[PDB]
Design a protein around this motif. Structure first.
Motif, PDB file in Angstrom:
ATOM      1  N   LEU A   1       0.833  -1.203   0.000  1.00 48.56           N
ATOM      2  CA  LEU A   1       0.000   0.000   0.000  1.00 48.56           C
ATOM      3  C   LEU A   1       0.867   1.251   0.000  1.00 48.56           C
ATOM      4  O   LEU A   1       1.883   1.302   0.697  1.00 48.56           O
ATOM      5  N   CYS A   2       0.436   2.263  -0.756  1.00 48.70           N
ATOM      6  CA  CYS A   2       1.125   3.548  -0.772  1.00 48.70           C
ATOM      7  C   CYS A   2       1.010   4.198   0.601  1.00 48.70           C
ATOM      8  O   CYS A   2      -0.094   4.403   1.110  1.00 48.70           O
ATOM      9  N   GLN A   3       2.152   4.547   1.185  1.00 46.54           N
ATOM     10  CA  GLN A   3       2.185   5.075   2.535  1.00 46.54           C
ATOM     11  C   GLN A   3       1.725   6.520   2.619  1.00 46.54           C
ATOM     12  O   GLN A   3       1.149   6.920   3.632  1.00 46.54           O
ATOM     13  N   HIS A   4       1.952   7.307   1.576  1.00 44.35           N
ATOM     14  CA  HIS A   4       1.464   8.688   1.588  1.00 44.35           C
ATOM     15  C   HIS A   4      -0.046   8.697   1.442  1.00 44.35           C
ATOM     16  O   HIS A   4      -0.732   9.436   2.157  1.00 44.35           O
ATOM     17  N   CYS A   5      -0.573   7.883   0.529  1.00 43.75           N
ATOM     18  CA  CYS A   5      -2.022   7.742   0.411  1.00 43.75           C
ATOM     19  C   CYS A   5      -2.647   7.317   1.741  1.00 43.75           C
ATOM     20  O   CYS A   5      -3.658   7.880   2.162  1.00 43.75           O
ATOM     21  N   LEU A   6      -2.034   6.355   2.418  1.00 40.99           N
ATOM     22  CA  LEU A   6      -2.598   5.864   3.677  1.00 40.99           C
ATOM     23  C   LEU A   6      -2.711   6.996   4.698  1.00 40.99           C
ATOM     24  O   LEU A   6      -3.729   7.111   5.397  1.00 40.99           O
TER      25      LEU A   6
ATOM     26  N   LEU B   1       5.316   3.662  -2.415  1.00 45.84           N
ATOM     27  CA  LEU B   1       4.518   4.745  -2.975  1.00 45.84           C
ATOM     28  C   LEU B   1       3.812   4.319  -4.256  1.00 45.84           C
ATOM     29  O   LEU B   1       4.326   3.500  -5.027  1.00 45.84           O
ATOM     30  N   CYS B   2       2.648   4.917  -4.495  1.00 43.70           N
ATOM     31  CA  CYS B   2       2.015   4.873  -5.804  1.00 43.70           C
ATOM     32  C   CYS B   2       2.706   5.857  -6.748  1.00 43.70           C
ATOM     33  O   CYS B   2       3.517   6.677  -6.326  1.00 43.70           O
ATOM     34  N   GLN B   3       2.365   5.795  -8.035  1.00 41.30           N
ATOM     35  CA  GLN B   3       3.011   6.683  -9.002  1.00 41.30           C
ATOM     36  C   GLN B   3       2.721   8.149  -8.708  1.00 41.30           C
ATOM     37  O   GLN B   3       3.616   8.979  -8.794  1.00 41.30           O
ATOM     38  N   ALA B   4       1.473   8.480  -8.391  1.00 37.92           N
ATOM     39  CA  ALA B   4       1.135   9.868  -8.152  1.00 37.92           C
ATOM     40  C   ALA B   4       1.963  10.426  -6.996  1.00 37.92           C
ATOM     41  O   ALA B   4       2.485  11.541  -7.082  1.00 37.92           O
ATOM     42  N   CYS B   5       2.111   9.648  -5.925  1.00 33.02           N
ATOM     43  CA  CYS B   5       2.886  10.122  -4.783  1.00 33.02           C
ATOM     44  C   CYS B   5       4.379  10.137  -5.070  1.00 33.02           C
ATOM     45  O   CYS B   5       5.090  11.021  -4.573  1.00 33.02           O
ATOM     46  N   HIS B   6       4.878   9.185  -5.856  1.00 28.88           N
ATOM     47  CA  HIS B   6       6.264   9.227  -6.288  1.00 28.88           C
ATOM     48  C   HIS B   6       6.546  10.471  -7.135  1.00 28.88           C
ATOM     49  O   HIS B   6       7.531  11.171  -6.903  1.00 28.88           O
TER      50      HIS B   6
HETATM   51 MN   LIG Z   1      -0.103   7.453  -3.090  1.00 19.70          MN
END
Ligand SMILES: [Mn+2]
Length: 92
Positions: free
Chosen positions: A37-42, A75-80
């Motif tokens: 799971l993307c940690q920033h999204c979480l 991270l997901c792409q958007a957060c990367h």
């Molecule tokens: Mn994310």
């Protein structure tokens, strides 16, 4: 040495790092720990599959923290992409 040669060696070291056995293993350990799971999204109360493991302090800024799990985030792409832009303000 000169600044240019030291920069060259630093960059060659970083390039090689991503092929290394230790990175391959650690990347998997971080993704597993994070349940992919993307940690920033979480933190933003969103569920998004992670696609990459990124260094919090960039690899090219602190070589000593290259394998520290508390210096790594799934991270997901958007957060990367967001982080990449932010890091340019910090470092160039
Ligand atoms: Mn994310």
């Amino acid at each position: 040495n000169d600044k240019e040669y030291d920069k060259h060696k630093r960059n060659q070291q970083a390039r090689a790092f991503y092929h290394s056995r230790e990175w391959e293993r650690t990347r998997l350990a971080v993704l597993a720990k994070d349940n992919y799971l993307c940690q920033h999204c979480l933190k933003e109360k969103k569920i998004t599959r992670a696609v990459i493991v990124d260094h919090i302090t960039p690899l090219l800024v602190d070589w000593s923290k290259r394998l520290d799990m508390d210096n790594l985030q799934s991270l997901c792409q958007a957060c990367h992409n967001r982080k990449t832009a932010e890091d340019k303000r910090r470092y160039g």
